[PDB]
């Protein structure tokens, strides 16, 4: 009231509550923007991971794809033959 002035925002200590109306919406005040600022680095950089299309890490993806899909066909019928022996292990443990 000394210069009759209202001030919106301008208080950077404020921990925001859960039960506010999120109504008609703009960029918020900075007490909602100095908090949740590590997210904006975390969100847009992984969106920026697309826009390069970087060619070296793509080959580490597909070799990790090819080794993983062939790890199934190499390790197939070795878990299912032990789970059948684990299936018999139930019928001796439950009778125990």
């Amino acid at each position: 009231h000394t210069s009759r002035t209202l001030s919106f925002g301008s208080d950077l200590n404020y921990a925001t509550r859960e039960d506010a109306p999120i109504g008609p919406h703009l960029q918020s005040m900075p007490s909602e923007q100095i908090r949740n600022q590590l997210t904006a680095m975390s969100s847009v950089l992984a969106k920026a991971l697309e826009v390069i299309k970087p060619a070296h890490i793509l080959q580490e993806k597909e070799e990790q794809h090819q080794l993983a899909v062939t790890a199934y066909l190499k390790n197939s019928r070795k878990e299912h033959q032990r789970i059948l022996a684990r299936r018999q292990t139930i019928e001796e443990r439950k009778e125990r």
Partner: protein
């Protein structure tokens, strides 16, 4: 006991599925857990949950798990709770019910709000044998409580969890991650929670006020006995002087299983809010590096 608990991937995603559809405001919702225990490791591969209201429901599904050649041996039971408070007499009564059938049995208490703000909270704890000891003899009595000693560090021991899968899930993890919408993982580093911290401390404050209630009456039980011991020793000196010249109820204490139950419940506040403490303080101190070049 059990030194290790280990999961297959099917138990956790159906544990989310009873939170994701079924109860949303705050519901205790609960299940069974499943698996065989190969030596020194409790292997979990399955669950099926229970709606909000029994053994006939539990046992009928056991034939169903046998119909498809899937493992059908009940190990333990899980339950969803609020922020830090799962410790009740009712789950511990429903845990020693399952500690009695099989010698190894578990709670994995799934807290859906601590996951949504941060780290994964499933609390895979097991019963200590000395708390198995006091209920088998069924003496909830303070005189055997000190011989069969229970102090609050072995009140719920914790079994560490290691994630296990087949490699076709790793195919399907590699299959899904490429073909998907880009879901950014940002929700860990959130850096505003004071009502997640607030209701953590406010649910703590009523139990310490419950603990304040317990030791204020513990004065009065001593104020009951300190009068009555001297009054009966006044009645000792009253009645022993009487027969030379010629020639009652003691109170119970507050029943001391609730006084151990409150300290172990306040033990749940103490581990989590101080793990909550540097959790936010780490993202505060990485944000010291975020403002650090900006003049």
């Amino acid at each position: 006991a059990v030194k290790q608990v280990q999961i297959d991937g099917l138990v956790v995603l159906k544990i989310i599925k009873h939170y994701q559809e079924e109860g949303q405001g705050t519901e205790v919702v609960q299940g069974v857990l499943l698996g065989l225990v190969v030596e020194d490791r409790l292997e979990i591969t399955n669950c099926f949950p229970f709606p909000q209201h029994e053994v006939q429901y539990q046992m009928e599904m056991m034939r169903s798990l046998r119909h498809v050649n899937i493992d059908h041996l009940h190990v333990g039971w899980y339950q969803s709770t609020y922020y830090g408070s799962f410790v009740t007499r009712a789950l511990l009564d429903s845990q020693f019910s399952y500690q009695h059938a099989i010698e190894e049995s578990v709670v994995l208490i799934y807290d859906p709000i601590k996951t949504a703000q941060g780290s994964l909270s499933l609390k895979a704890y097991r019963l200590t044998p000395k708390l198995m000891e006091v209920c088998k003899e069924k003496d909830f009595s303070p005189e055997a409580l000190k011989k069969a000693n229970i102090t609050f560090e072995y009140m719920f021991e914790e079994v560490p969890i290691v994630i296990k899968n087949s490699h076709l899930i790793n195919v399907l993890m590699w299959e899904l991650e490429k073909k998907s919408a880009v879901a950014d993982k940002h929700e860990l580093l959130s850096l505003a929670s004071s009502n997640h911290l607030g209701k953590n401390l406010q649910l703590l404050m009523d139990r310490v006020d419950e603990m304040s209630q317990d030791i204020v009456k513990y004065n009065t039980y001593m104020r009951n006995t300190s009068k009555q011991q001297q009054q009966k020793h006044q009645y000792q000196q009253r009645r022993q002087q009487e027969n030379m010249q010629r020639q009652f109820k003691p109170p119970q204490p507050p029943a001391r299983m609730d006084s151990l139950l409150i300290a172990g419940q306040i033990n749940t506040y103490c581990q989590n809010i101080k793990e909550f403490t540097a959790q936010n303080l780490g993202k505060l101190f990485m944000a010291q590096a975020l403002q650090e070049y900006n003049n």
